[PDB]
């Protein structure tokens, strides 16, 4: 009937931990080309097997909205870019005034331009005129025959990305260290927040590929379920929506121009990658979707949201109607040049009371981008030569309501993509890092010899 309080080492116990995590990815030798965007050569290789072990009858909280690993996982992505850029060539001798007008074509479809222009050679007092081919968005006018200036020249500098590095995304496994542990949730009908009844223990994320995408996600994870999707608080418009599928449908973005290029030397070791002559047809950037699958995956996105605005209510859709050029349209990367398509055909339907027909979506291509909504030194994207063709696997989307109007009568809303880290909530919502508190005192009757 006497009680001592005795200690134990290694008690299964944990605390909401705030700490910095690390990446682990299986190493690609890949001696052909080199230097990946993020993984580079520094991420540690994943172990031959990462051990996954089920925590039985355990139920533990999850809140992906004040989740920190996203604020980290973009804190990185912004960062090392600004060190994958710094070793590459600095493009300030180019903000020169460099005359052009339209490109050879029967006047049909700011398609593109072709300027001919001053430049500095390797030698100093020596100069040279040569020509290149830009796009409408990279330059803006002021005054003669005619001639414009580069859109960013207004406010920021530029460092062109080294074409040796490539921005093809690869799986990244974020890792919690010893003294901590991440953990995954494992019920399919789990919505955005709440304790998860089915839980199993991981230490390093599954392979997350950091796709740079605005208003949509794709080539991501896919739940075995019917696409049930969450907000910070749906009741309010201002906070976004983040869908992601159950069976992906295909997306193939295209522009069939074989660009040519030409290395030209600005000075000591600096070689600017001018776009060269087009050989072949003139062809705009676009992207195909067969509606047959789109409207029916849509169809299941239709019915489930219903469970939050009544089973008897309107729903709606049309195109993005707010913001800047970059986010109002599908910003992303494909093979080296970035796309911007009005998603007009897609947001085309109203579904109330419950032969190939492939969508085709016009896009424009950029080269000089102030990404992640960060003013400062821009990046000039080198062109891409020959054809291009990128297949794809739609998994999700991002949306935001418009707010004030009559309740439940006919409220409207529209995709927003106000911030990107909603890209990170896409597949970082199973995971949650946690501390080890491994030592516990507890009462039993044992006690060793009182030495007196």
């Amino acid at each position: 009937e006497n009680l001592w309080v005795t200690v134990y080492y290694g008690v299964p116990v944990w605390k909401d931990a705030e700490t910095t995590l690390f990446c682990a990815s299986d190493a690609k030798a890949y001696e052909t080309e080199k230097h990946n965007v993020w993984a580079t050569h520094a991420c540690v290789p994943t172990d031959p097997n990462p051990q996954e072990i089920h925590l039985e009858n355990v139920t533990e909280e999850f809140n992906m909205w004040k989740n920190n690993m996203v604020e980290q996982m973009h804190t990185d992505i912004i960062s090392l870019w600004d060190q994958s850029l710094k070793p590459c060539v600095k493009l300030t001798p180019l903000c020169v005034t460099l005359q052009c007008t339209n490109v050879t074509n029967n006047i049909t479809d700011g398609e593109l331009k072709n300027c001919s222009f001053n430049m500095t050679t390797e030698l100093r007092d020596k100069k040279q005129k040569v020509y290149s081919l830009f796009y409408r968005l990279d330059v803006v006018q002021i005054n003669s025959n005619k001639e414009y200036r580069l859109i960013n020249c207004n406010t920021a500098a530029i460092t062109q990305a080294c074409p040796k590095v490539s921005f093809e995304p690869i799986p990244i496994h974020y890792c919690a260290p010893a003294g901590f542990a991440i953990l995954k949730c494992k019920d399919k009908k789990f919505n955005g927040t709440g304790p998860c009844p089915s839980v199993s223990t991981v230490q390093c994320t599954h392979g997350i590929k950091p796709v740079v995408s605005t208003q949509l996600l794709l080539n991501g994870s896919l739940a075995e379920e019917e696409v049930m999707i969450r907000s910070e608080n749906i009741a309010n418009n201002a906070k976004n929506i983040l869908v992601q599928f159950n069976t992906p449908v295909q997306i193939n973005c295209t522009r069939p121009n074989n660009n040519t290029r030409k290395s030209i030397r600005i000075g000591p070791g600096q070689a600017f990658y001018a776009t060269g002559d087009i050989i072949g047809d003139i062809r705009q950037a676009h992207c195909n979707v067969s509606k047959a699958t789109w409207n029916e995956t849509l169809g299941k996105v239709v019915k489930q949201l219903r469970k939050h605005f009544g089973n008897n209510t309107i729903i709606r859709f049309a195109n993005s109607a707010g913001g800047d050029l970059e986010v109002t349209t599908h910003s992303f990367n494909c093979g080296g040049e970035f796309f911007y398509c009005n998603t007009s055909g897609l947001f085309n339907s109203t579904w109330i009371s419950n032969s190939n027909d492939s969508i085709t979506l016009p896009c424009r291509i950029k080269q000089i981008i102030n990404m992640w909504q960060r003013i400062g030194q821009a990046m000039y994207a080198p062109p891409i030569q020959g054809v291009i063709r990128c297949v794809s696997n739609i998994t999700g989307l991002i949306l935001t309501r418009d707010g004030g109007s009559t309740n439940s009568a006919t409220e409207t809303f529209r995709p927003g993509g106000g911030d990107m880290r909603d890209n990170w909530r896409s597949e970082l919502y199973k995971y949650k890092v946690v501390k080890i508190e491994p030592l516990g005192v507890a009462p039993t009757r044992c006690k060793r010899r009182v030495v007196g």
Binding site: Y8, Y9, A27, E56, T444, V451
Partner: protein, 148 residues
Amino acid sequence: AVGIGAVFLGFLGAAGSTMGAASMTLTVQARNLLSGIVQQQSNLLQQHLLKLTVWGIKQLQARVLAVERYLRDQQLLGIWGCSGKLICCTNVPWNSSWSNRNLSEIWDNMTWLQWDKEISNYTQIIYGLLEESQNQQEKNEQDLLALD
């Protein structure tokens, strides 16, 4: 992937099990606590000059925090006389204003997480003298009694 059921049970696999069950699985925790070498290799499993990529040094910050919080934890054990030994018995009685319930009522009834939650407030104060009345004045004794 598909669940394989060959090994039992694993690191924190007894977190959903009562304290008595987990009290026997204290070692599937003690090895995974410190080991930052099994999972991170002194040399990797040539264009680059040096490796001060921030994969490098904020991995580097992590490894020491892995040890120091262990190292200060196991010092607490060095304070209470249990260094190489995972469980530890204890001399000063428990006056139960910290918990009114029984002995069976915890090891069979609750789990470890489900026991810290309730005395998480009384935690610091107890560690005040699980050494003083237990070890600070356990060995002036055998100082004064191995005196002869």
